Amino acid sequence: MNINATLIGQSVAFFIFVLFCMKFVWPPVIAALQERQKKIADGLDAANRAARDLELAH
Amino acid sequence: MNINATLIGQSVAFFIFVLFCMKFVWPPVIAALQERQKKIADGLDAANRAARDLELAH
Amino acid sequence: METVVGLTAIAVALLIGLGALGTAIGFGLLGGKFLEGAARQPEMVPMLQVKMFIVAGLLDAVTMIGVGIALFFTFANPFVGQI
Amino acid sequence: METVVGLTAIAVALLIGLGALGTAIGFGLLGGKFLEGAARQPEMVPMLQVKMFIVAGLLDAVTMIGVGIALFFTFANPFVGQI
Amino acid sequence: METVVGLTAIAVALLIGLGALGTAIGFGLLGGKFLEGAARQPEMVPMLQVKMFIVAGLLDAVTMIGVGIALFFTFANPFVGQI
Amino acid sequence: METVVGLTAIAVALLIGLGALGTAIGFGLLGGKFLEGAARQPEMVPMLQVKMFIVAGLLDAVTMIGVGIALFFTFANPFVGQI
Amino acid sequence: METVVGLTAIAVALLIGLGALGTAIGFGLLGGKFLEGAARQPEMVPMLQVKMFIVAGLLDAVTMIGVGIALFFTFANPFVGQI
Amino acid sequence: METVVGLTAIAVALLIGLGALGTAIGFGLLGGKFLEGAARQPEMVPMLQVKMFIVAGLLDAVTMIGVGIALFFTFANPFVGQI
Amino acid sequence: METVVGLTAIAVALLIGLGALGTAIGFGLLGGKFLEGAARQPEMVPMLQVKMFIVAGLLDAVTMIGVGIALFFTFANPFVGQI
Amino acid sequence: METVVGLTAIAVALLIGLGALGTAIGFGLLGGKFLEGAARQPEMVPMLQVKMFIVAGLLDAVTMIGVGIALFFTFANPFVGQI
Amino acid sequence: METVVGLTAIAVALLIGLGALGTAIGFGLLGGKFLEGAARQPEMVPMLQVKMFIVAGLLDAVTMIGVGIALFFTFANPFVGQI
Amino acid sequence: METVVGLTAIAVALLIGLGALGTAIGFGLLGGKFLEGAARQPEMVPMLQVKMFIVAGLLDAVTMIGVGIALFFTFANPFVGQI
Amino acid sequence: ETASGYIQHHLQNLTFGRLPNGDWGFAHTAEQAKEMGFWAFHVDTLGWSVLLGVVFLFIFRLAAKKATSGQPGGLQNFVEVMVEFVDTSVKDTFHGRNPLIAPLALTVFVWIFLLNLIDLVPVDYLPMLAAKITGDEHLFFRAVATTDPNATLGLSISVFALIVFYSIKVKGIGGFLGELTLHPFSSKNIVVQILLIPVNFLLEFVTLIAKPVSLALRLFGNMYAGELIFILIAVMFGSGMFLLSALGVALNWAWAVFHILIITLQAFIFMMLTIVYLSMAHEDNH
């Protein structure tokens, strides 16, 4: 069918949305997931260290 | 070709499809997201309990 | 003009039909070994998946040259010019 | 003009027929391996089913380009315009 | 006129005959592996039977489009109207 | 008239001829695994025999449509009435 | 009649020729598994031979209809009457 | 008539050639399994060789009908008349 | 005579060509199983080689009828004598 | 002139279509065995890959000659001038 | 004069083309099991190699008749003298 | 003049297309077994490569004849002189 | 009006070009549109694709701009599920350190899904509302953006620019040309290597050029057949016969339910092929 300059316009739109997504959408969301994952890891490791500390008291 | 007839036919079919998706595809997705919402709440709550961990000074 | 144009619809149907036939059987042979490898070795699935898509690039290459020259004969015509 | 129209009916039949032939044999190969993989261990059936649909879109790719063009030669007609 | 009408009888035979050929071989490949897996794990037969009918819907997908366009060509004719 | 009638004899031969070719190959693929399953699990042959007849109806679905249309074309030709 | 009869000799060759091709390949697959089962466990032969004849009925079912129609078009002729 | 006579030379070639193709491939599948069974169980060869000839009678059943009709159309002709 | 003689060249090409195609694929299937058996049990080779020639006689039977009829249609002609 | 130019359009579709069909099926077979070997022996993957490409060179050699000559028959024409 | 010379060009393409198609697939089947046998029994490769050449003589037997007749029709055409 | 010249483009397309189809499928079968053998015994790979090249010579022999006769029919066509 | 006229009207895009009539100009007939040069834009397709791109980008930014770190809200919970799924798919396919692949995969998946989502509504609802709002009862208008080859080619050509760019950036210009001529076959001596360089290029260049074409046509094929089958099913109701209309509604529902798989698979497969093709421009496979 008709091949037109529409593919140039589509290419411009693709890069604009990907560059905005990379700078203002993906980093803030993955940072929240990483902070939460660290809190869940620390929630087990700090609790296990505090429970094991009793061996020194004994 | 009765253009009005085509519109009525498409409308009836779309209504049935929407009803199906609403009572078939919507329930599993909302349930899956609400279960994740509860797992996160349990995980965060459990960390808070671990935060409330104290060792006897004897 | 009528014979060259009517025989170009048959040419297009053979370029896209034989390519559609060979790639649907080729991906049924390739993919059938990927599903078994994924069952025999559950931990290898991410490696087998990337290795399968390398083969998929070899499998459809000549088919796509035929689907591309077929679309060129459907919206342009290098033969009608030869009259 | 009747030759271009009559050879377009054959072009549509070859274009859908070779696609129906390739997709039915191609999924009989892929589907057979999926059922065989399910028999080794039913704990992996959900994972294997997701992998089958990932291959089903590669297998049924070119067969749908011919079904789309065939329904575009029956109602619209790029060969009649060319005289 | 006579050539378009005579060549649409053969276009219907290619649409239904190539679909019949593919669907009959595709179910021999898929059903042979269903009976082989049903012998391996006879307690999983109910599960494999449902997974086989999901794949049967994928084989008879492009074949039903061609059997529907071939019945459209015998009781109506989109080519005859084009003179 | 002769071109519509003569090409109908070929349309009929293609409808049942391709159906015979696909069902004979399809029942050789399906039946070959039924005899292997019966040789490995002889106490399960009553179950495997019932499972085979469920696949036989799917394997002959599009082929019997072709046979029905082939007999229709021979004793009540729908193209001779379209001038 | 020249064209009708002429094209009916081809129709008969396609009916018996495609039927012979499918039936010969189908029994090669079915029979190959019968000998494999007979060698794997020789005491199963009385049962496996009867199961092979049940499948042989399904395998030749469409081929025998094709041969029946081919001998009908050879000695009688429905198309000739249509004039 | 020149065309009735000339189309029976092609009818005979299809009728013998498709039979030769199917019978040659069919015996490759059946015979390959006879050698596999004979190597596994040398003491069963007297029985396996007799069972192979039972299958060989079904495999060639339609091919010999095709060869009989092809020689009939070569030394006699049912299509040459009716003209 | 021109079209009867011209179509006899294609009839001969189909008789020898389809025979060569089937016999070459058939010996590829039978031959692969003979080498597999010879590798598994090298002491069985004298027996397996004689059983292969018994199968080779059944495999080429119809192909040699086809080649015999093709040489007959080349140096003599039963169709030209019918005008 | 138009019959030579129209038959050249079909010759090009026949050159590319059969090469597309052959390579797509060929890579389904070759690549299918590469994934099977990669799953069993994941340590052999870097070595098997190099070997897969050795074969890929032999598998496409004639096909590249075929698509090269097909493109030559579209942008140039050694037959049109022969007329 | 021209249809006999035109059709004999296609008769030669069928004789060599179908022979090339069948022998390339036949040697893929035969040779695949030769390498599998040699990979299974490294010390038997000089014995399996002579057995493969005995089978190669059967596999190409009819194909050599086909290319022999094809070169005879090309340089000393036997049908152009019968019109 | 035009029929002989036009039907030689179809003859050239069949000589290379059928050869390409067979060679591509043949190497898919042969190479698939070579990768299986290389994965099984990686110490024998240098020996399996030379053995594969022995078979590759036999597999492409008739294909090289067909592409050598197709480049002879293309440049200095032998049938044009016959009329 | 005849059914051939309705189908032929539906298969035409809203096109714009600088015609001599004035600075602004639109195509009023199919022939007049096809007569224009390659310098004319399909305004309906650019309009819908940009609008849905901004909708995707806006709803994700509404969550990202207020991410709670702890307990997530109703929208943030959905946004996190998409990010977690894409990052899992990227880490399983690519082992490098490039920060562009994950934002690209998320954008490509959600955008292509939304471009296809507007296909589930009745095919002539949007065209009639667009015609009535514009005041022209004969206006051309197509809602689904992926049924136009240009939209799918715009997506694949842009992905190909990234594939060539990263390949040259990490392998170097001389190294990239080297992969296309020194692999897969090489030799210890120059006399054999010079005979292998055309064979190496004949294998690599063909397999490189098929990547942008396959991505576009694989996405376009299933979608174009899907819209066209809905247009043909809509003509079934236009006949006014009760039994034929009953068959039409049953087929429309069955086809739409089947399409819920197709819409998901084409968006997912375009995302996976994008990740895979970019991941093999940072590694070596010969």
Short mmCIF file of C-alpha atoms in Angstrom, two decimals, chain G residues 1-62:
data_model
loop_
_atom_site.label_atom_id
_atom_site.label_comp_id
_atom_site.label_asym_id
_atom_site.label_seq_id
_atom_site.Cartn_x
_atom_site.Cartn_y
_atom_site.Cartn_z
CA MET G 1 -17.68 -32.93 -25.29
CA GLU G 2 -13.99 -32.97 -26.36
CA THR G 3 -13.09 -30.61 -23.48
CA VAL G 4 -15.42 -32.22 -20.88
CA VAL G 5 -14.21 -35.81 -21.63
CA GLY G 6 -10.56 -34.70 -22.02
CA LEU G 7 -10.50 -33.07 -18.57
CA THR G 8 -12.33 -36.11 -17.07
CA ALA G 9 -9.37 -38.39 -17.91
CA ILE G 10 -7.23 -36.04 -15.73
CA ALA G 11 -9.91 -36.01 -12.97
CA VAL G 12 -9.80 -39.85 -12.76
CA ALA G 13 -5.98 -39.81 -12.63
CA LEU G 14 -6.06 -37.30 -9.72
CA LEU G 15 -8.73 -39.32 -7.82
CA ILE G 16 -6.91 -42.68 -7.99
CA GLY G 17 -3.35 -41.17 -8.07
CA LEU G 18 -3.68 -39.01 -4.90
CA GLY G 19 -5.57 -41.85 -3.17
CA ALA G 20 -2.82 -44.38 -4.04
CA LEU G 21 -0.12 -41.91 -2.86
CA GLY G 22 -1.77 -41.28 0.54
CA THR G 23 -2.75 -44.94 1.16
CA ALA G 24 0.76 -46.24 0.31
CA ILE G 25 2.49 -43.68 2.63
CA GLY G 26 -0.15 -44.18 5.38
CA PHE G 27 0.36 -47.98 5.49
CA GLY G 28 4.16 -47.43 5.54
CA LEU G 29 3.71 -45.47 8.82
CA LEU G 30 1.02 -47.77 10.34
CA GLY G 31 2.77 -50.99 9.28
CA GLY G 32 6.20 -49.76 10.46
CA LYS G 33 4.79 -49.46 14.02
CA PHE G 34 3.02 -52.86 13.77
CA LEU G 35 6.37 -54.62 13.03
CA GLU G 36 8.10 -52.59 15.81
CA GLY G 37 5.43 -53.69 18.35
CA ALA G 38 5.52 -57.32 17.08
CA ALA G 39 9.33 -57.39 17.59
CA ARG G 40 9.20 -55.58 21.00
CA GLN G 41 6.75 -58.14 22.50
CA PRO G 42 5.89 -61.15 20.20
CA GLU G 43 3.03 -62.45 22.42
CA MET G 44 0.99 -59.26 21.53
CA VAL G 45 0.70 -60.16 17.78
CA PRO G 46 -2.88 -61.65 17.91
CA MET G 47 -4.13 -58.35 19.44
CA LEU G 48 -1.94 -55.90 17.45
CA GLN G 49 -2.98 -57.48 14.12
CA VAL G 50 -6.71 -56.93 14.90
CA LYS G 51 -6.01 -53.32 16.05
CA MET G 52 -4.12 -52.69 12.77
CA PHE G 53 -7.17 -53.82 10.75
CA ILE G 54 -9.45 -51.43 12.75
CA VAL G 55 -7.15 -48.47 11.83
CA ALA G 56 -6.77 -49.73 8.21
CA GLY G 57 -10.57 -49.23 7.83
CA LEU G 58 -10.29 -45.52 8.81
CA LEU G 59 -7.12 -45.05 6.69
CA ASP G 60 -8.70 -46.32 3.42
CA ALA G 61 -12.26 -44.92 4.10
CA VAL G 62 -11.84 -41.76 1.92
#
